[PDB]
Amino acid sequence: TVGAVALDLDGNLAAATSTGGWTNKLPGRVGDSPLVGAGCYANNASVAVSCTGTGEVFIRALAAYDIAALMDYGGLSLAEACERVVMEKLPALGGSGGLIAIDHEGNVALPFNTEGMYRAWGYAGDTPTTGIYRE
Amino acid sequence: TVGAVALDLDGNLAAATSTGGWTNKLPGRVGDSPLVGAGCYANNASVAVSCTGTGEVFIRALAAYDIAALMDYGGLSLAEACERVVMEKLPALGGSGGLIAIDHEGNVALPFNTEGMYRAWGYAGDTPTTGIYR
Amino acid sequence: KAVIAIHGGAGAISRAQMSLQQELRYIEALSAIVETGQKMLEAGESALDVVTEAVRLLEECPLFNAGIGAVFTRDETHELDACVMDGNTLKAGAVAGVSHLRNPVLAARLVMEQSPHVMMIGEGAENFAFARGMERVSPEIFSTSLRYEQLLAARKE
Amino acid sequence: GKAVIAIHGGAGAISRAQMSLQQELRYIEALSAIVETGQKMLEAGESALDVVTEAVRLLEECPLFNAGIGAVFTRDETHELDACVMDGNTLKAGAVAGVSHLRNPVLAARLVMEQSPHVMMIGEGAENFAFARGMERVSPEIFSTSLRYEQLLAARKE
Ligand SMILES: [Ca+2]
Ligand SMILES: [Ca+2]
Ligand SMILES: [Cl-]
Ligand SMILES: [Cl-]
Ligand SMILES: [Cl-]
Ligand SMILES: [Cl-]
Ligand code: NA
Ligand code: NA
């Protein structure tokens, strides 16, 4: 699974996700990646999110939309919503993985509960940051 | 599209949805019915929901989960959440249809913004009600 | 307070285009299925068993666009989709794009209970269901004159 | 606020002990090149939708990442690819699942969003739709890599 989120100079948010699934996958199995609100969500009023992980738990917990709803309805910051979903709710259901998120104010978060997540981010005009392991 | 929601005597919620799609559908099109949080959702902490309508707008608005989130995070009543989703948000996205919902307290709602919705409801130990039109 | 609700679809249902006998057949079908669920809930059956059985009955009923009585695609085929979710465990099962399974809601529950997965599509979903002992049906078992005539009307407009 | 991009190439069990620096630098170089492409597009006033589409297309093209070229193998030694894109301005979205004959699933997902009334297409129906909109059929072998084939053989032995 791979993905991208962005906030443009016009204040628009977008998200995209793509995957080949899992080694040795049961043919016809669908994970969170192609499912709106599970592995991919964007709304100018809140956040853009792309997820990666074990799949089934991100569907059951509607992980990408849940970030948006915690912020929009719950009043949580992006940091608070990311902690709640990735570090508390997903593990409670036996889920592992992470996500990338940008809110309408340009805050960026790359939470993961796994040993690693291949990732990078950068503000327009600035030097990018890359990561594989935990900080 | 068809569906059912229930709250049992043990306090458990459940939802199910099933469809043949739309007459003259483009082969391979998927609507909200098989998508968790779009056409079908249940959580003992909030609500059980099954949706029916034009499909795409229920996916884009995650209609079934949005009811749950408006209640759980927004503090909306089931009636307030149903009014917001079915009468305001879905029509704003160009959508039409309805849903059935039961909350963890046993409140039941069958909102729809269409001319009709084939529907029924009943409490355990009481008489059922059916409906077609508004 | 145990309770069931069911639906058989929202849309442009108008008194002007309906007959009283048609309305009575819908009312009888909805009443019979909601009463089945009420009596299951009264007997202490689970919400999951109740919503599964109510949807199975709406599938079997040719008046409703699910299972028997499914609408036709552009290609004169049937493509069926279903989902079930258990609010106690937050487990869910779903199938999309299946043509050779009589009861899609039972195939959805099979994904939930007899696999680690949530969603299966197309021939892979069908092959999984068959491996788990669900029967393969002829794709024409869902076909009805009423729904075929609706496809011809859609082609005229 | 300021324009910004983030990308990922998957979360999982990644350990220093199991990895080499040569492998690590290949991933860092790939992530850096892709995020810099997106940063430059944002700086030039390109849309968030075009930026995430291009970043995911590049992650698909890159055989290091499990999407497009470099996809994992199914139990049946096939590739089944899925993708989604969403526009936060219109709340439109497009998605494909179970596609085997489209080089860039994220571009097929964007075709569903932009050139149909629909959100999600699967399998043969998704491919036939894409071919009608001018996308080319590819051999499913174009995604296949020795690294992912060896991972399948090891998962079977396990
Ligand atoms: Ca009474
Ligand atoms: Ca049982
Ligand atoms: Cl390190
Ligand atoms: Cl009525
Ligand atoms: Cl009469
Ligand atoms: Cl080919
Ligand atoms: Na039926
Ligand atoms: Na790739």
Coordinates of C-alpha atoms and ligand atoms in Angstrom, one line a residue:
Chain A
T1 CA 0.0 0.0 0.0
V2 CA 1.1 3.5 -0.9
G3 CA -0.6 6.9 -0.6
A4 CA -0.4 10.7 -0.7
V5 CA -2.2 13.7 0.9
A6 CA -1.8 17.4 -0.1
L7 CA -3.0 20.9 0.7
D8 CA -2.5 23.2 -2.3
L9 CA -2.1 27.1 -2.5
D10 CA -5.9 27.4 -3.0
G11 CA -6.6 25.7 0.3
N12 CA -7.9 22.4 -1.3
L13 CA -7.2 19.0 0.3
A14 CA -6.9 15.7 -1.6
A15 CA -5.9 12.1 -0.9
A16 CA -5.0 9.0 -2.9
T17 CA -4.2 5.4 -2.0
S18 CA -3.1 2.4 -4.2
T19 CA -2.1 -1.2 -3.3
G20 CA -1.4 -4.7 -4.5
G21 CA -2.8 -6.1 -1.3
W22 CA -1.0 -8.9 0.7
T23 CA 1.4 -11.7 -0.3
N24 CA -0.6 -14.9 -0.7
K25 CA -3.9 -13.0 -0.5
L26 CA -7.2 -14.9 -1.0
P27 CA -8.3 -13.9 -4.5
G28 CA -11.2 -11.3 -4.3
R29 CA -10.2 -10.0 -0.8
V30 CA -10.6 -6.1 -0.6
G31 CA -8.8 -4.1 2.1
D32 CA -9.3 -0.5 3.2
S33 CA -7.3 1.1 0.3
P34 CA -10.1 1.5 -2.3
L35 CA -12.8 2.2 0.2
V36 CA -13.8 5.9 0.8
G37 CA -13.6 6.7 4.6
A38 CA -11.6 3.5 5.4
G39 CA -8.2 3.9 3.5
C40 CA -8.8 7.3 1.7
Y41 CA -10.7 10.4 2.6
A42 CA -10.5 14.2 1.9
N43 CA -12.7 17.1 2.9
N44 CA -11.7 20.8 2.8
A45 CA -13.6 21.3 6.1
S46 CA -11.3 18.9 8.1
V47 CA -8.5 16.6 6.7
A48 CA -7.0 14.5 3.9
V49 CA -6.0 11.0 5.0
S50 CA -4.4 7.9 3.3
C51 CA -4.0 4.7 5.4
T52 CA -1.7 1.6 5.4
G53 CA -2.0 -1.5 7.5
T54 CA -3.6 -4.8 8.1
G55 CA -6.8 -3.6 6.2
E56 CA -9.8 -5.2 7.9
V57 CA -9.5 -3.1 11.1
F58 CA -9.2 0.2 9.1
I59 CA -12.6 -0.8 7.4
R60 CA -14.3 -1.8 10.7
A61 CA -13.2 1.4 12.4
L62 CA -13.6 3.7 9.2
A63 CA -10.2 5.0 10.2
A64 CA -9.8 7.8 7.5
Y65 CA -13.3 9.2 8.1
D66 CA -12.9 8.8 11.9
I67 CA -10.0 11.2 11.9
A68 CA -12.2 13.8 10.1
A69 CA -15.2 13.2 12.4
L70 CA -13.2 13.4 15.6
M71 CA -11.9 16.8 14.4
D72 CA -15.1 18.2 12.9
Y73 CA -17.7 16.9 15.5
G74 CA -15.4 16.1 18.5
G75 CA -13.2 19.3 18.2
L76 CA -10.0 17.2 18.5
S77 CA -6.7 18.6 17.0
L78 CA -5.2 16.5 14.2
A79 CA -2.5 15.3 16.7
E80 CA -5.3 14.2 19.2
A81 CA -7.4 12.5 16.5
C82 CA -4.3 10.6 15.1
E83 CA -3.4 9.4 18.7
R84 CA -7.0 8.3 19.3
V85 CA -7.3 6.3 16.0
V86 CA -3.8 4.9 15.4
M87 CA -2.5 4.4 19.0
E88 CA -5.8 3.5 20.9
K89 CA -8.7 2.5 18.7
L90 CA -6.9 0.4 16.0
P91 CA -4.8 -1.6 18.4
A92 CA -7.9 -2.3 20.6
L93 CA -9.4 -4.1 17.5
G94 CA -6.1 -6.0 16.8
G95 CA -5.2 -3.6 14.0
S96 CA -1.6 -2.5 13.1
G97 CA -0.5 0.2 10.6
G98 CA -0.5 3.9 10.2
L99 CA -1.7 6.8 8.1
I100 CA -0.7 10.2 6.8
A101 CA -2.9 13.2 7.3
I102 CA -3.0 17.0 6.5
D103 CA -5.7 19.3 8.0
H104 CA -7.2 22.4 6.4
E105 CA -4.7 24.6 8.5
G106 CA -1.6 22.8 7.0
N107 CA -0.8 20.6 10.1
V108 CA 0.8 17.3 9.0
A109 CA 0.9 14.0 10.9
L110 CA 2.3 10.5 10.0
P111 CA 1.3 8.3 12.9
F112 CA 2.0 4.5 12.9
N113 CA 1.9 1.8 15.6
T114 CA 4.2 -0.5 13.5
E115 CA 8.1 -0.9 13.7
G116 CA 8.2 1.3 10.5
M117 CA 6.4 3.2 7.8
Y118 CA 8.1 4.3 4.6
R119 CA 7.2 8.0 4.5
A120 CA 8.1 11.6 3.5
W121 CA 6.7 15.0 3.8
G122 CA 7.5 18.6 2.9
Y123 CA 6.1 22.2 2.9
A124 CA 6.2 23.8 -0.6
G125 CA 9.5 25.7 -1.0
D126 CA 11.2 23.8 2.0
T127 CA 13.5 20.7 2.3
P128 CA 11.6 17.4 2.7
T129 CA 11.9 14.9 5.5
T130 CA 12.1 11.2 4.9
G131 CA 11.5 8.3 7.4
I132 CA 11.5 4.5 7.7
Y133 CA 11.9 3.7 11.4
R134 CA 10.5 5.4 14.6
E135 CA 11.9 8.8 15.9
Chain B
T1 CA -32.0 -2.4 -2.0
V2 CA -33.4 -3.9 1.2
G3 CA -32.1 -3.9 4.8
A4 CA -32.8 -4.5 8.5
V5 CA -31.5 -3.1 11.8
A6 CA -32.2 -4.6 15.3
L7 CA -31.6 -4.1 19.0
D8 CA -31.9 -7.4 20.9
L9 CA -32.9 -8.1 24.6
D10 CA -29.1 -8.4 25.5
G11 CA -28.5 -4.8 24.2
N12 CA -26.7 -5.8 21.0
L13 CA -27.2 -3.8 17.8
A14 CA -26.8 -5.3 14.2
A15 CA -27.4 -4.1 10.6
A16 CA -27.6 -5.8 7.2
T17 CA -28.2 -4.5 3.7
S18 CA -28.6 -6.4 0.3
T19 CA -29.2 -5.1 -3.2
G20 CA -29.4 -6.0 -6.9
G21 CA -28.2 -2.4 -7.7
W22 CA -30.0 -0.3 -10.4
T23 CA -31.9 -1.1 -13.6
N24 CA -29.5 -0.7 -16.5
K25 CA -26.5 -0.4 -14.2
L26 CA -23.0 -0.2 -15.8
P27 CA -21.5 -3.7 -15.0
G28 CA -18.9 -3.5 -12.2
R29 CA -20.4 -0.4 -10.5
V30 CA -20.5 -0.7 -6.7
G31 CA -23.0 1.4 -4.6
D32 CA -23.1 2.0 -0.9
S33 CA -24.9 -1.3 0.1
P34 CA -21.7 -3.5 0.6
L35 CA -19.5 -0.7 2.0
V36 CA -19.1 -0.6 5.8
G37 CA -20.0 2.9 7.0
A38 CA -21.7 3.8 3.7
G39 CA -24.8 1.5 3.4
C40 CA -24.4 -0.6 6.6
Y41 CA -23.0 0.1 10.1
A42 CA -23.6 -1.1 13.6
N43 CA -21.9 -0.3 16.9
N44 CA -23.3 -1.1 20.4
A45 CA -22.1 2.3 21.7
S46 CA -24.2 4.3 19.1
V47 CA -26.5 3.0 16.3
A48 CA -27.3 0.3 13.7
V49 CA -28.0 1.8 10.2
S50 CA -29.1 0.4 6.8
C51 CA -29.3 2.8 3.9
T52 CA -31.1 2.9 0.5
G53 CA -30.9 5.4 -2.3
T54 CA -28.9 6.7 -5.3
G55 CA -25.6 5.1 -4.0
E56 CA -22.7 7.4 -4.8
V57 CA -23.7 10.2 -2.4
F58 CA -24.1 7.7 0.6
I59 CA -20.4 6.6 -0.1
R60 CA -19.1 10.2 -0.5
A61 CA -20.9 11.3 2.8
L62 CA -20.3 7.9 4.6
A63 CA -24.0 8.2 5.6
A64 CA -24.3 5.2 7.9
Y65 CA -21.1 6.0 10.0
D66 CA -22.0 9.8 9.9
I67 CA -25.2 9.0 11.9
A68 CA -23.0 7.2 14.5
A69 CA -20.3 9.9 14.6
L70 CA -22.9 12.8 14.8
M71 CA -24.4 11.0 17.9
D72 CA -21.1 9.7 19.5
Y73 CA -18.9 12.9 18.9
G74 CA -21.5 15.6 18.1
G75 CA -23.9 14.6 20.9
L76 CA -26.9 14.7 18.4
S77 CA -30.0 12.7 19.2
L78 CA -30.9 9.9 16.7
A79 CA -33.7 12.3 15.3
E80 CA -31.2 15.2 15.0
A81 CA -28.5 13.0 13.2
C82 CA -31.1 11.5 10.8
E83 CA -32.4 15.1 9.9
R84 CA -28.8 16.3 9.3
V85 CA -27.8 13.4 7.1
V86 CA -31.0 12.5 5.1
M87 CA -32.7 16.0 4.8
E88 CA -29.6 18.3 4.6
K89 CA -26.2 16.6 3.7
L90 CA -27.3 14.0 1.2
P91 CA -29.5 16.3 -0.9
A92 CA -26.7 19.0 -0.8
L93 CA -24.5 16.3 -2.6
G94 CA -27.2 15.6 -5.2
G95 CA -28.4 12.4 -3.4
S96 CA -31.8 11.0 -2.7
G97 CA -33.0 8.1 -0.6
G98 CA -33.4 7.1 3.1
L99 CA -32.2 4.9 5.9
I100 CA -33.4 3.0 8.9
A101 CA -31.7 3.4 12.3
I102 CA -31.9 2.1 15.9
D103 CA -29.8 3.6 18.7
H104 CA -28.5 1.8 21.8
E105 CA -31.6 3.2 23.8
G106 CA -34.1 1.6 21.4
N107 CA -35.1 4.8 19.5
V108 CA -36.0 4.0 15.9
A109 CA -36.0 6.3 12.9
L110 CA -36.9 5.7 9.2
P111 CA -36.0 9.0 7.5
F112 CA -36.3 9.4 3.7
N113 CA -36.2 12.4 1.3
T114 CA -38.0 10.5 -1.5
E115 CA -41.7 10.1 -2.5
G116 CA -41.6 6.7 -0.8
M117 CA -39.7 4.1 1.1
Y118 CA -41.0 0.5 1.6
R119 CA -40.5 0.1 5.4
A120 CA -41.8 -1.4 8.7
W121 CA -40.8 -1.4 12.4
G122 CA -41.9 -2.9 15.6
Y123 CA -40.9 -3.4 19.2
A124 CA -40.7 -6.9 20.7
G125 CA -44.1 -7.6 22.3
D126 CA -46.0 -4.9 20.4
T127 CA -47.8 -4.4 17.0
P128 CA -45.9 -3.7 13.8
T129 CA -46.3 -0.6 11.6
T130 CA -45.7 -0.6 7.8
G131 CA -45.3 2.3 5.4
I132 CA -44.9 3.0 1.7
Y133 CA -45.5 6.8 1.2
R134 CA -44.7 9.9 3.4
Chain C
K1 CA -36.4 -2.3 24.6
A2 CA -35.8 -4.8 21.7
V3 CA -36.9 -3.5 18.3
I4 CA -36.5 -4.2 14.5
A5 CA -36.8 -2.0 11.5
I6 CA -36.7 -3.1 7.8
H7 CA -36.8 -1.4 4.4
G8 CA -37.3 -2.6 0.9
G9 CA -35.9 0.5 -0.9
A10 CA -36.5 4.3 -1.1
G11 CA -37.4 6.1 -4.4
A12 CA -40.1 7.5 -6.7
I13 CA -43.0 5.4 -5.4
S14 CA -46.2 7.4 -6.5
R15 CA -49.9 6.6 -5.8
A16 CA -50.6 7.7 -9.4
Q17 CA -48.4 4.8 -10.8
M18 CA -49.3 2.1 -8.2
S19 CA -52.5 -0.1 -7.9
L20 CA -54.1 -0.8 -4.6
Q21 CA -53.5 -4.6 -5.1
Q22 CA -49.7 -3.8 -5.6
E23 CA -49.7 -1.7 -2.4
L24 CA -51.5 -4.6 -0.4
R25 CA -48.9 -7.1 -1.6
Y26 CA -46.0 -4.8 -0.4
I27 CA -47.8 -4.2 3.0
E28 CA -48.4 -8.0 3.4
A29 CA -44.8 -8.8 2.6
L30 CA -43.3 -6.1 4.9
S31 CA -45.7 -7.0 7.8
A32 CA -44.9 -10.8 7.5
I33 CA -41.1 -10.1 7.6
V34 CA -41.1 -7.5 10.4
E35 CA -43.4 -9.8 12.5
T36 CA -40.9 -12.7 12.0
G37 CA -38.2 -10.4 13.4
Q38 CA -40.3 -9.1 16.3
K39 CA -41.1 -12.8 17.3
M40 CA -37.4 -13.8 17.1
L41 CA -36.4 -10.7 19.3
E42 CA -39.2 -11.6 21.8
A43 CA -37.8 -15.2 22.0
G44 CA -34.3 -13.8 22.8
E45 CA -32.7 -14.3 19.4
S46 CA -29.6 -12.1 18.7
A47 CA -29.8 -8.9 16.7
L48 CA -27.3 -10.4 14.2
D49 CA -29.5 -13.5 13.6
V50 CA -32.6 -11.2 13.3
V51 CA -31.1 -8.8 10.7
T52 CA -29.6 -11.8 8.8
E53 CA -33.0 -13.6 8.6
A54 CA -35.0 -10.4 7.8
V55 CA -32.7 -9.7 4.9
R56 CA -32.7 -13.3 3.8
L57 CA -36.5 -13.1 3.6
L58 CA -36.4 -9.8 1.7
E59 CA -34.0 -11.5 -0.7
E60 CA -36.3 -14.5 -1.2
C61 CA -39.3 -12.1 -1.7
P62 CA -39.5 -11.3 -5.5
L63 CA -41.2 -7.9 -4.8
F64 CA -37.8 -6.5 -3.5
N65 CA -34.6 -5.6 -5.4
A66 CA -32.3 -8.1 -3.6
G67 CA -31.8 -11.8 -4.3
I68 CA -34.8 -13.2 -6.2
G69 CA -36.3 -10.1 -8.0
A70 CA -33.0 -8.3 -8.5
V71 CA -32.9 -5.6 -11.2
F72 CA -31.0 -6.3 -14.4
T73 CA -27.8 -4.6 -15.4
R74 CA -27.2 -3.0 -18.9
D75 CA -26.0 -6.5 -20.0
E76 CA -29.2 -8.3 -18.9
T77 CA -27.2 -9.8 -15.9
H78 CA -27.6 -9.6 -12.2
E79 CA -24.8 -8.3 -9.9
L80 CA -25.7 -8.6 -6.2
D81 CA -24.1 -6.9 -3.2
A82 CA -24.6 -7.2 0.6
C83 CA -23.1 -6.3 4.0
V84 CA -23.7 -7.4 7.6
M85 CA -22.3 -5.8 10.8
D86 CA -22.3 -7.0 14.4
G87 CA -22.3 -4.0 16.8
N88 CA -21.1 -6.2 19.7
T89 CA -17.7 -7.2 18.1
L90 CA -17.6 -4.5 15.3
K91 CA -17.0 -7.5 12.9
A92 CA -18.5 -7.1 9.4
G93 CA -18.8 -9.1 6.3
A94 CA -19.6 -8.0 2.7
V95 CA -19.7 -9.3 -0.9
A96 CA -20.0 -7.2 -4.0
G97 CA -20.5 -8.2 -7.7
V98 CA -21.8 -11.7 -7.1
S99 CA -24.1 -13.5 -9.6
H100 CA -24.0 -17.2 -8.6
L101 CA -25.0 -17.0 -4.8
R102 CA -28.7 -17.2 -3.9
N103 CA -28.5 -15.2 -0.7
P104 CA -25.8 -12.5 -0.7
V105 CA -26.5 -11.6 3.0
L106 CA -25.6 -15.2 3.9
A107 CA -22.4 -14.9 1.8
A108 CA -21.6 -11.6 3.6
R109 CA -22.1 -13.4 7.0
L110 CA -19.9 -16.3 5.7
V111 CA -17.0 -13.8 5.0
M112 CA -17.5 -12.4 8.6
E113 CA -17.7 -15.8 10.4
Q114 CA -15.6 -18.2 8.2
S115 CA -12.7 -15.9 7.2
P116 CA -10.5 -13.2 8.8
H117 CA -11.7 -10.8 6.1
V118 CA -14.4 -8.1 5.8
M119 CA -15.0 -7.7 2.0
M120 CA -14.9 -10.1 -0.9
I121 CA -15.7 -9.3 -4.6
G122 CA -16.7 -11.1 -7.8
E123 CA -15.6 -14.6 -8.7
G124 CA -13.2 -14.7 -5.8
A125 CA -16.1 -14.1 -3.4
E126 CA -18.1 -16.9 -5.1
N127 CA -15.1 -19.4 -5.1
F128 CA -14.6 -18.7 -1.3
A129 CA -18.3 -19.2 -0.6
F130 CA -18.3 -22.5 -2.6
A131 CA -15.1 -23.7 -0.8
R132 CA -17.1 -23.1 2.5
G133 CA -20.0 -25.2 1.3
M134 CA -22.4 -22.5 -0.1
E135 CA -24.3 -23.7 -3.2
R136 CA -23.6 -22.3 -6.7
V137 CA -26.9 -21.3 -8.5
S138 CA -27.7 -20.6 -12.2
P139 CA -27.5 -16.8 -12.7
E140 CA -31.2 -16.7 -14.1
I141 CA -32.7 -17.8 -10.7
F142 CA -33.1 -14.1 -9.8
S143 CA -34.7 -13.1 -13.1
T144 CA -38.4 -11.9 -13.2
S145 CA -40.6 -10.5 -16.0
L146 CA -41.4 -7.4 -13.9
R147 CA -37.8 -6.4 -13.7
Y148 CA -37.0 -7.3 -17.3
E149 CA -39.9 -5.1 -18.5
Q150 CA -38.3 -2.2 -16.4
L151 CA -35.0 -2.7 -18.2
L152 CA -36.9 -2.5 -21.6
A153 CA -38.6 0.7 -20.4
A154 CA -35.3 2.2 -19.4
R155 CA -33.9 1.4 -22.9
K156 CA -37.0 3.1 -24.6
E157 CA -36.5 6.4 -22.5
Chain D
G1 CA -2.0 27.4 5.8
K2 CA 1.2 26.7 3.7
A3 CA 0.9 24.1 0.9
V4 CA 2.3 20.7 1.9
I5 CA 2.5 17.1 0.8
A6 CA 3.0 13.8 2.7
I7 CA 3.5 10.3 1.1
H8 CA 3.8 6.8 2.4
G9 CA 5.0 3.5 0.9
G10 CA 3.4 1.2 3.6
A11 CA 3.5 0.5 7.3
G12 CA 4.7 -2.8 8.8
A13 CA 7.5 -4.9 10.4
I14 CA 10.6 -3.0 9.1
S15 CA 13.7 -3.6 11.3
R16 CA 17.4 -2.4 11.1
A17 CA 18.6 -6.0 12.0
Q18 CA 16.7 -7.4 8.9
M19 CA 17.6 -4.4 6.5
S20 CA 20.9 -3.2 5.0
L21 CA 22.0 0.4 4.6
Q22 CA 22.1 -0.1 0.7
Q23 CA 18.4 -1.1 0.8
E24 CA 17.5 1.8 3.2
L25 CA 19.2 4.4 1.0
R26 CA 17.3 3.1 -2.1
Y27 CA 14.0 3.6 -0.2
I28 CA 15.1 7.1 1.1
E29 CA 16.2 8.2 -2.4
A30 CA 12.8 7.0 -3.9
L31 CA 10.7 8.7 -1.2
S32 CA 12.8 11.9 -1.4
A33 CA 12.4 12.1 -5.3
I34 CA 8.6 11.6 -5.1
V35 CA 8.0 14.1 -2.3
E36 CA 10.2 16.7 -4.0
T37 CA 8.2 16.3 -7.3
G38 CA 5.0 17.0 -5.3
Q39 CA 6.5 19.9 -3.4
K40 CA 7.6 21.5 -6.7
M41 CA 4.1 20.9 -8.2
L42 CA 2.5 22.6 -5.1
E43 CA 5.0 25.6 -5.3
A44 CA 4.0 26.0 -9.1
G45 CA 0.3 26.2 -8.1
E46 CA -0.8 22.7 -9.2
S47 CA -4.0 21.3 -7.5
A48 CA -3.9 19.0 -4.5
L49 CA -5.8 16.5 -6.7
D50 CA -3.1 16.5 -9.4
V51 CA -0.3 16.4 -6.8
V52 CA -1.6 13.3 -4.9
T53 CA -2.5 11.6 -8.3
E54 CA 1.1 12.1 -9.5
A55 CA 2.8 11.1 -6.3
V56 CA 0.8 7.8 -6.2
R57 CA 1.4 7.2 -9.9
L58 CA 5.2 7.5 -9.1
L59 CA 4.8 5.1 -6.1
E60 CA 3.0 2.7 -8.4
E61 CA 5.8 3.0 -11.1
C62 CA 8.5 2.4 -8.4
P63 CA 9.1 -1.4 -8.0
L64 CA 10.2 -0.9 -4.3
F65 CA 6.5 -0.2 -3.3
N66 CA 3.5 -2.6 -3.2
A67 CA 1.3 -0.8 -5.7
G68 CA 1.4 -1.0 -9.5
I69 CA 4.8 -2.3 -10.6
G70 CA 6.2 -4.3 -7.7
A71 CA 2.7 -5.4 -6.5
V72 CA 2.6 -8.5 -4.2
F73 CA 1.3 -11.8 -5.6
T74 CA -2.0 -13.4 -4.6
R75 CA -2.3 -17.1 -3.5
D76 CA -2.9 -17.8 -7.3
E77 CA 0.4 -16.0 -8.4
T78 CA -1.8 -13.2 -9.9
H79 CA -1.9 -9.4 -9.2
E80 CA -5.1 -7.8 -7.9
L81 CA -4.7 -4.0 -7.6
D82 CA -7.0 -1.4 -5.8
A83 CA -6.9 2.4 -5.6
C84 CA -8.9 5.4 -4.4
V85 CA -8.7 9.2 -4.9
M86 CA -10.8 11.9 -3.2
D87 CA -11.2 15.6 -3.9
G88 CA -11.8 17.5 -0.6
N89 CA -13.2 20.5 -2.6
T90 CA -16.1 18.7 -4.4
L91 CA -16.2 15.6 -2.1
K92 CA -16.1 13.6 -5.3
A93 CA -14.1 10.3 -5.2
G94 CA -13.2 7.5 -7.6
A95 CA -12.0 4.0 -6.8
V96 CA -11.2 0.6 -8.5
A97 CA -10.7 -2.8 -6.9
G98 CA -9.7 -6.1 -8.4
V99 CA -8.0 -4.7 -11.5
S100 CA -5.2 -6.8 -13.2
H101 CA -4.8 -5.2 -16.7
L102 CA -4.5 -1.4 -15.9
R103 CA -0.9 -0.1 -15.4
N104 CA -1.8 2.7 -13.0
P105 CA -4.8 1.9 -10.7
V106 CA -4.8 5.5 -9.3
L107 CA -5.3 6.9 -12.9
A108 CA -8.2 4.4 -13.4
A109 CA -9.7 5.6 -10.0
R110 CA -9.4 9.2 -11.3
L111 CA -11.2 8.2 -14.6
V112 CA -14.1 6.8 -12.5
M113 CA -14.3 10.1 -10.6
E114 CA -14.0 12.5 -13.6
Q115 CA -15.5 10.5 -16.6
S116 CA -18.4 8.7 -14.9
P117 CA -21.2 9.5 -12.4
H118 CA -19.9 6.7 -10.2
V119 CA -17.5 6.3 -7.2
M120 CA -16.4 2.7 -7.3
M121 CA -15.8 0.1 -10.1
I122 CA -14.5 -3.5 -9.8
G123 CA -12.9 -6.2 -11.9
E124 CA -13.7 -6.6 -15.6
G125 CA -16.4 -3.9 -15.5
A126 CA -13.8 -1.4 -14.2
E127 CA -11.3 -2.4 -17.0
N128 CA -13.9 -2.3 -19.8
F129 CA -14.9 1.3 -18.6
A130 CA -11.2 2.3 -18.5
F131 CA -10.6 0.9 -22.0
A132 CA -13.7 2.8 -23.3
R133 CA -12.1 6.1 -21.9
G134 CA -8.8 5.3 -23.8
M135 CA -6.7 3.6 -21.1
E136 CA -4.6 0.7 -22.6
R137 CA -4.7 -2.9 -21.6
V138 CA -1.5 -4.3 -20.1
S139 CA -0.2 -7.9 -19.5
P140 CA -0.6 -8.7 -15.8
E141 CA 3.0 -9.9 -15.8
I142 CA 4.2 -6.2 -16.1
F143 CA 3.8 -5.8 -12.3
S144 CA 5.8 -9.0 -11.4
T145 CA 9.2 -8.8 -9.7
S146 CA 11.5 -11.6 -8.5
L147 CA 11.6 -9.9 -4.9
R148 CA 7.8 -10.3 -4.5
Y149 CA 7.7 -13.8 -6.2
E150 CA 10.4 -15.0 -3.6
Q151 CA 8.2 -13.5 -0.8
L152 CA 5.2 -15.6 -2.1
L153 CA 7.4 -18.8 -2.2
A154 CA 8.6 -18.1 1.3
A155 CA 5.0 -17.5 2.6
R156 CA 3.9 -20.8 1.1
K157 CA 6.9 -22.7 2.8
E158 CA 5.8 -20.9 6.1
Ligands
CA1 CA -48.8 -0.7 21.5
CA2 CA -27.5 -18.2 15.3
CL3 CL 17.0 3.8 13.0
CL4 CL -48.1 4.6 3.5
CL5 CL -58.4 -3.2 -5.8
CL6 CL -3.4 -9.0 -21.0
NA7 NA -36.0 -10.3 -3.4
NA8 NA 5.2 0.2 -7.3

